[PDB]
Amino acid sequence: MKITLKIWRQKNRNTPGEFKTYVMDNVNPDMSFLEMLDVLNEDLMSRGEEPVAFDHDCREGICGMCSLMINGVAHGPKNAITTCQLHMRSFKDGDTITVEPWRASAFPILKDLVVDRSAFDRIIQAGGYISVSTGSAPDANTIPVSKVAADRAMDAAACIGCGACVAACPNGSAMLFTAAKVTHLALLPQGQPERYQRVVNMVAQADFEGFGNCTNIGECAAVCPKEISLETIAQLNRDLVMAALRGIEPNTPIVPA
């Protein structure tokens, strides 16, 4: 396959970036998108140019750091997969593919295609957990969790933190990620003691980090690799309404270190 790539190239946070055109004469349909990027990087290194920087660890769609806006769709044209899971057979010979980082205020761009997604970490730090210490846990079978509740909490808990929801959201909002974590912890009994506090805190953190609001558009669920439903956002909305009824107010926001 002959493939033209218009790749975003940014030197650092402060330097403005631009689209650069790279033509690859031989592209294997079985090659994954990240492997094609790696081949391009080797070609650039041989030619003496700067290789394109992108985030990747697992190449399995599980860790979450692969983060590319390919041809306008987060994680590529195919849904329910990641950038690493996207293979070049999804494209055609002669295609032009535009490769971009995540564009969000809370996801600063550090290099060509690398963004800084620590705002997700701070949202998690703002109550996206169960405050249980080591050694104090009771027996594992003490509290019964229904199979349906466990399945829903696993559907919400299966979030790789890639940030594609923020990227494809027109407002740049982290409502799918925050809603997934809130729904995961809310559907289990162990998350009952803090949930109405937790949601508020997490929501406030998403406001503090610099994310937008949820217009209920739904691109987040469209581009989510793990097919996280909008029912997580409805669950978060119910939790926040109930917490407002209880007078729950957010704590001090988690400040970057």
């Binding site: 290194m45 290789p51 985030d55 190449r59 620590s118 730090q125 210490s133 299966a158």
Partner: protein, 631 residues
């Protein structure tokens, strides 16, 4: 000399007796100590979170964007525990016996018993943290059977149990970061270990966004940096997995315990070309309902479904008629590698074998096979573009786990005082073969229920503070790191980093892989210095040091790998026996199984860096088995 520091008496009370006899740090005094935790995987996140909960000042590091991006989110299989929830005869002693026998009697018994004893607390803590384990309709936990066990002792959270375990550990770590007890430094790679007055008193790191070289000082150092399975270029590990931290510690004085103990996964999706370096781990239960074969004619360009049954060389059936098609992973994978090295060409590059399910689909129900392997077939069709229901699936072995690492005593401490190694980065409990669902258990055990006691025992006997980063040792380590980085950037050779890593991995896979012999290991020991010299004279690392240079990270990791591989080959040559994953062709049963030499090789080989990469000093730690007698 190596002091295992194991307790005495009955093995059931050894951990409790040791915990009582350990020294303690008061909750008020814990704020006066600093613990650096390099690594945020299961072991790293659990350890950092638990030490922050205790009250210590924890400095946690990871090279990833986030701590949650650490390896072992990719762990698909569940986690074992001796809770006997299935009423099938499982027990702490049974888990300990199974782990000792699975490792082929090459590990300390006390550590294995401690792991099996604290697995139950691991599961309790994971459930309390909100890990969404599988439940049955009555609300209670569900168990499934894992490999190497005749009991259903494995707790799983769908097909991504490792992801949920690391998410719980990461949520605890995030709680501690919010509380201020843990300082997290993501995208920061430790590049050296600073040993002051014989103690591991800090680390030298590089922030791989700005390129800044920083020095951190602490009272204790923990190396939860995962395994070194990427010394073989083609492996199931994450792309960034390396051995930089443990090799720097080894050069600083830490003994490498059994570096040649490497595990493999029999069922991995093969590569589509020389560009690919990662093999995606498919579940190894695909061999239960599939047949392994290649065409008899090498130049068979027909579709695999069109090849007649008589024209299919169903090896593992004609060869090894006993236990046909369910041969152990080592024998089957060695046969697969031999077949692919002879030259068959069924894959893109010729590296692969047909695990077909056509006869399984006809014999069973396609609905039942779907209910068994739906996600696996969907993932294989996504990666390869071929439906396993019609086309035979292609598989190829790849290096999976490294049971080796830095030698640690019963207190999880290396030969350097103050340097603790947990998780896959140490040798510890797996012996010569890691059982399924045992590495997650070991990492969580080390983080949650072992290291918090042993590091407190160490810290109570030393004075808090007293070492700052302005000491000469920090300056020497920083100068060494800066000189290495400048030299790597200044070579401007003709070959890329991945070229050298590919050459090194191919040599290690051919010579020090699943099948090892003295001649091949000696050839590898000759070739490794040549590849290392070619790397240090002819490698191309573009970019600048004070920039996001991923090529620099890869160059440093491969530079450490080129030295570690020589030690791995030396250890494989030294061990004149076959045990677990380590296989020697001249020491095997007629059936092809491993043939141990318990009279002369019943010990742990800890290798000491003597300054010469070709002549490390061997320290034997004898193994005595009082409860699980070798057989």
């Amino acid at each position: 000399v190596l002091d295992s520091k194991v307790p005495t008496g009955p093995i059931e009370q050894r951990w409790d007796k040791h915990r009582f006899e350990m020294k303690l740090v008061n909750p008020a005094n814990r704020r006066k100590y600093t613990i650096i935790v390099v690594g945020s995987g299961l072991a790293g996140a659990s350890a950092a979170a638990t030490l922050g909960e205790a009250g210590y000042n924890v400095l946690c590091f990871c090279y990833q964007d986030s701590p949650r991006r650490a390896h072992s989110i990719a762990a698909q299989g569940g986690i074992n525990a001796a809770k006997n929830y299935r009423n099938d005869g499982d027990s702490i002693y049974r888990l300990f016996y199974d782990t000792v026998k699975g490792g082929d009697f090459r590990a300390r018994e006390s550590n294995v018993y401690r792991l099996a004893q604290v697995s139950v607390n691991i599961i309790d803590q994971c459930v309390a943290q909100g890990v969404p384990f599988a439940r049955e309709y009555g609300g209670l936990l569900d168990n499934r059977s894992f490999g190497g066990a005749q009991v259903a002792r494995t707790f799983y959270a769908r097909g991504q149990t490792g992801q949920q375990l690391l998410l719980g550990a990461y949520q605890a770590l995030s709680r501690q970061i919010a509380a201020g007890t843990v300082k997290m430094f993501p995208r920061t790679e430790m590049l050296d270990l600073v040993v002051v007055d014989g103690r591991a008193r800090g680390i030298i790191t590089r922030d791989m966004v700005t390129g800044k070289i920083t020095r951190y000082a602490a009272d204790a150092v923990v190396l939860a940096t995962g395994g070194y399975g990427n010394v073989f270029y083609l492996s199931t590990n994450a792309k960034g997995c390396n051995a930089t931290a443990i090799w720097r510690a080894h050069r600083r004085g830490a003994f490498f315990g059994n570096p040649c103990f490497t595990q493999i996964h029999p069922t991995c999706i093969p590569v589509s070309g020389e560009y690919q370096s990662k093999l995606t781990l498919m579940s190894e239960s695909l061999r239960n309902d599939g047949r392994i074969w290649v065409p008899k004619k090498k130049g068979d360009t027909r579709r695999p479904q069109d090849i007649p049954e008589s024209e299919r060389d169903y090896y593992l059936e004609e060869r090894y008629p006993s236990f046909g098609n369910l041969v152990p992973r080592d024998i089957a994978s060695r046969a697969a590698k031999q077949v692919c090295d002879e030259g068959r060409g069924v894959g893109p590059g010729g590296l692969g074998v047909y695990l077909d399910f056509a006869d399984a689909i006809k014999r069973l129900g396609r609905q039942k096979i779907a209910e068994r392997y739906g996600n696996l077939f969907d993932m294989y069709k996504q990666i390869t573009g071929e439906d396993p229901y019609e086309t035979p699936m292609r598989i190829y072995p790849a290096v999976h786990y490294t049971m080796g690492g830095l030698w640690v005593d019963y207190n999880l401490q290396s030969t350097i005082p103050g340097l603790f190694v947990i998780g896959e980065a140490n040798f510890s409990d797996h012996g010569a073969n890691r059982l399924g669902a045992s590495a997650l258990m070991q990492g969580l055990a080390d983080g949650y229920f072992i290291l918090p006691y042993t590091i407190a025992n160490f810290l109570a006997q030393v004075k808090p503070g007293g070492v700052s980063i302005d000491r000469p040792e920090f300056a020497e380590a920083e100068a060494e790191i800066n000189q290495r980085i400048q030299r790597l950037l200044s070579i401007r050779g003709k070959r890329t980093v991945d070229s050298f890593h590919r050459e090194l991995g191919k040599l290690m896979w051919d010579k020090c892989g699943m099948a090892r012999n003295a001649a091949g290991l000696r050839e590898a020991l000759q070739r490794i210095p040549e590849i290392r010299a070619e790397f240090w004279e002819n490698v191309n690392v573009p970019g600048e040091a004070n920039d996001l240079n991923q090529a620099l990270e890869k160059a440093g990791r491969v530079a450490d790998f080129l030295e570690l591989a020589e030690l791995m080959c030396l250890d494989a040559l030294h061990r004149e026996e076959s045990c677990g994953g380590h296989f020697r062709e001249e020491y095997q049963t007629p059936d092809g199984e491993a043939l141990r030499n318990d009279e002369q090789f019943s010990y742990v080989a800890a290798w000491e860096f003597t300054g010469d990469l070709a002549k490390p000093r061997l320290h034997k730690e004898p193994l005595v088995f009082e409860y699980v007698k070798p057989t």
